[PDB]
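Progress narrative, Year 2. Work on Cystatin-C from Homo sapiens advanced from sequence curation to structure prediction during this period.
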Amino acid sequence: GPMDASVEEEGVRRALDFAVGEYNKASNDMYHSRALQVVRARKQIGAGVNYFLDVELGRTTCTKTQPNLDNCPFHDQPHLKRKAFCSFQIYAVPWQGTMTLSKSTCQDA
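Result:
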């Protein structure tokens, strides 16, 4: 590879959800962050599948306790949305049930 990939693919969508779940698990935020736009998606196939995803992330108005995490709009104030630009590397071995986050790097966008 790395050939191009698309958020239209199941694997990319599954990996993006994994990555954002991890990002949230690691955060000190009281609030759920979620993916705004997938900017670039590449995948490399071999021993497993390596997904490389570049993503804009934003803070939402829902808390992490909030039992529902699915009608969660982004903050409308820039200094509260705090848009971030993220590069994720996901190593998945789907035929063995493995999915791990190799690399996660986020700067302010």
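The chain is about 20% helix and 50% strand. Residues 10-26 form the longest helix (17 residues).
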